[PDB]
C-alpha cells in the first residue's frame, strides 16, 4: 500500500471488517494502521503550478 501524503485522524466511519479504503478516483484514500487499527485518512501533499 505504498504511497505519499499527509495522514490525518478522521471521522471516516470504516465498518469493523474494512481494512483499506478507496475514493471515487479509485486511489487509496483511507487506511487502517496495522499496528493499532486507527483510521488514517490520506490526502496528497500540497502541490501546483508555479
Amino acid at each position: 500500500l505504498t504511497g505519499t501524503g499527509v495522514l490525518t485522524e478522521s471521522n471516516k466511519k470504516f465498518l469493523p471488517f474494512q481494512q483499506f479504503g478507496r475514493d471515487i478516483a479509485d486511489t487509496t484514500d483511507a487506511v487502517r494502521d496495522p499496528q493499532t487499527l486507527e483510521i488514517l485518512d490520506i490526502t496528497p501533499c500540497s502541490f501546483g503550478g508555479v
Binding site: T4, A25, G49
Partner: protein, 487 residues
C-alpha cells in the same frame, strides 16, 4: 437501445433493435429496426423521443406509444389574388435565448498525472520529448481562450453605466431584471434564478478560476442593461445619450415600420403587456427547470469527459497492475522498465484523447461565444432587422442577463395578432393617373377605400399626400378606382 419516459415519470420502458427484423427477436417494425414494448398508434404528434425514420415515441394515455411524427397543423392560408390580411392588434413577447460562453478552465499537471511523483516513471517519460509539455501548452491555450471569450462578449460597454434611482421608465417595470440593492450579490432577480437552476478532490487536474468573477460579470451586465434602458443604441456608437424610454421605444417601433404614434396611443397597454411577459419569463424559468439545458449540457459534458480521464487512470492497459508503486515494489527494475512503459503509453494516449476532445469543444464554444458576441452587438446595442436573428418576431430590443457560463438574452419581439381580411388593389386610378401608396398599402372593405400602414390597421383617407402619381392607369395589372382627395 432502449427508449423510456424516464424514471421520474414512470418505470415503464420499450426497446429498439436497430437493424434486425422482429422475426429474429407487443411488436412493431420500422425502417429503424424492430421495436418491442411500444404500441404503434395511428394518429400523429410532436416527438417526445426520436426513434428514426419518422417514428417517434412518447408516453400517453398510460403506455409508451410510437407514432409517425406530425410536422404541424396543416392549414391552407387563404391566399388569393385581390386579397390581403392586416393585423389589427399586437402582442409583445419576451423569449429567452441561452448561449454558452465558456467552459471551465481545466489544467492538467501532465507529469503528475502520468507518473504520480515517481522518480522512475518521469525518468522514463522524459524519453518521450515534447509531449508532456505540449499538452500543457494546449490546455493553457484553451484556458486563455475562455477569458478571451468572456471579455469579447460582455465587455462591449466602454464604461459602467449606473442606472438612475427613480426608475420612472414610462410604466415599464425593470425591477425584475435590474440589480437589486437587497444585494445577495450584484446579481439581478432573474440572474439569481439562473445561478440556482443549474449546478455543477483531484490529482494533477485542477480548475483555474475565471478571470472575471461572477459578481463582476454581473456588474458588466448591469452596466449594459442600464445603457439600453437609458440611451438606446447610442451608447454603442458613442457616449451614452439620455433619452426618455418611451421615446426610445417609439424609435424602435419606427424601426419595424409601425408608425410611432401607434406606440403613444397605446403606451399604458404596451407596458402592461411587457411587464406580464417579464413575469412569464420569470415564472417559466422558476419551474421548467430543464430550460437551461443548453448550459447544463456543457457543464455535464465537460464533467463527464474529465471524470473519464480520472477513471482511465485506474486501467491496466495490460500492465501487471494499475498502480506504478504497486508494480515497482514487486517487479524487478529491468522488467518494470516494460510494465511502466505499458502504463505510460496507455495513460499518455488517454490524455491525448482528452486534450483533443477539449480542443474540439473549445472550438465549438468559441463559435458559440462569437455568436453570443454578435447577438449582444446587434440585438442589445442595436435593433437588428435580421428577420429571425433576435428571436421569433419583429425585433424591438433585447436585454442581457448573466448566467453561470453563458448569456440568457431576453429578446423582446413585437408579434402582430388579430388579423382582418380586406380586399386590396396595387394602385388607385384617378383622372387617369395611377396613384400608389407612398408607404402604406391600399385596402378596402368594399364600401370605401383606405390606405393603411403595412403592419397595423390604422386607416387614412386617401389624400394625394400619402400617395404619389405615376403611370397612366393602363399598365398596372389590377388597378381600382377611388376619389383621391387633395388638401
Amino acid at each position: 437501445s432502449v427508449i423510456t419516459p424516464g424514471t421520474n415519470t414512470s418505470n415503464q420502458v420499450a426497446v429498439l433493435y436497430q437493424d434486425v427484423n422482429c422475426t429474429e427477436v407487443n411488436v412493431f417494425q420500422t425502417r429503424a429496426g424492430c421495436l418491442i414494448g411500444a404500441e404503434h398508434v395511428n394518429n400523429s404528434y410532436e416527438c417526445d423521443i426520436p426513434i428514426g425514420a419518422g417514428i417517434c415515441a412518447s408516453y400517453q394515455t398510460q403506455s409508451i406509444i410510437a407514432y409517425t411524427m406530425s410536422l404541424g397543423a396543416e392549414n391552407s392560408v387563404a391566399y388569393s389574388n385581390n386579397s390581403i390580411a392586416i393585423p389589427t392588434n399586437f402582442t409583445i413577447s419576451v423569449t429567452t435565448e441561452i448561449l454558452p460562453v465558456s467552459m471551465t478552465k481545466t489544467s492538467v499537471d501532465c507529469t503528475m498525472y502520468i507518473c504520480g511523483d515517481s522518480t522512475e516513471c518521469s525518468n522514463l517519460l522524459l524519453q518521450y520529448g515534447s509531449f508532456c509539455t505540449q499538452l500543457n501548452r494546449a490546455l493553457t491555450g484553451i484556458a486563455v481562450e475562455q477569458d478571451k471569450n468572456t471579455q469579447e462578449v460582455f465587455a462591449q460597454v466602454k464604461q459602467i453605466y449606473k442606472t438612475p434611482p427613480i426608475k420612472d421608465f414610462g410604466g415599464f417595470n425593470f425591477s425584475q431584471i435590474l440589480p437589486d440593492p437587497s444585494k445577495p450579490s450584484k446579481r439581478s432577480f432573474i440572474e439569481d434564478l439562473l445561478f440556482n437552476k443549474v449546478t455543477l478532490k483531484f490529482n494533477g487536474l485542477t480548475v483555474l478560476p475565471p478571470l472575471l468573477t461572477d459578481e463582476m460579470i454581473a456588474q458588466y451586465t448591469s452596466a449594459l442593461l442600464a445603457g439600453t434602458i437609458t440611451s438606446g443604441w447610442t451608447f454603442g456608437a458613442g457616449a451614452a445619450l439620455q433619452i426618455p424610454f418611451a421615446m426610445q421605444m417609439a424609435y424602435r417601433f419606427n424601426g419595424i415600420g409601425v408608425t410611432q404614434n401607434v406606440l403613444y396611443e397605446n403606451q399604458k397597454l404596451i407596458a402592461n403587456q411587457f411587464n406580464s411577459a417579464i413575469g412569464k419569463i420569470q415564472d417559466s424559468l422558476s419551474s421548467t427547470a430543464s430550460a437551461l439545458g443548453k448550459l447544463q449540457d456543457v457543464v455535464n459534458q465537460n464533467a463527464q469527459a474529465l471524470n473519464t480521464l480520472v477513471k482511465q487512470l485506474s486501467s491496466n492497459f495490460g500492465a501487471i497492475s494499475s498502480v506504478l508503486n504497486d508494480i515497482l515494489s514487486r517487479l524487478d527494475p529491468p522488467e518494470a522498465e516494460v510494465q511502466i512503459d505499458r502504463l505510460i503509453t496507455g495513460r499518455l494516449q488517454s490524455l491525448q484523447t482528452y486534450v483533443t476532445q477539449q480542443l474540439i469543444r473549445a472550438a465549438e464554444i468559441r463559435a458559440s461565444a462569437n455568436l453570443a458576441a454578435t447577438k449582444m452587438s446587434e440585438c442589445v446595442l442595436g435593433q437588428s432587422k435580421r428577420v429571425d436573428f433576435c428571436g421569433k418576431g419583429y425585433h424591438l430590443m433585447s436585454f442581457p442577463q448573466s448566467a453561470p457560463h453563458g448569456v440568457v438574452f431576453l429578446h423582446v419581439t413585437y408579434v402582430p395578432a388579430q388579423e382582418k381580411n380586406f380586399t386590396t388593389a396595387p394602385a388607385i386610378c384617378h383622372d387617369g393617373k395611377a396613384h400608389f401608396p407612398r408607404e402604406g398599402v391600399f385596402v378596402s372593405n368594399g364600401t370605401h377605400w383606405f390606405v393603411t400602414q403595412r403592419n397595423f390597421y390604422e386607416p387614412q383617407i386617401i389624400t394625394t399626400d400619402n400617395t404619389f402619381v405615376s403611370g397612366n392607369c393602363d399598365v398596372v395589372i389590377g388597378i381600382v378606382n377611388n376619389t383621391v382627395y387633395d388638401p
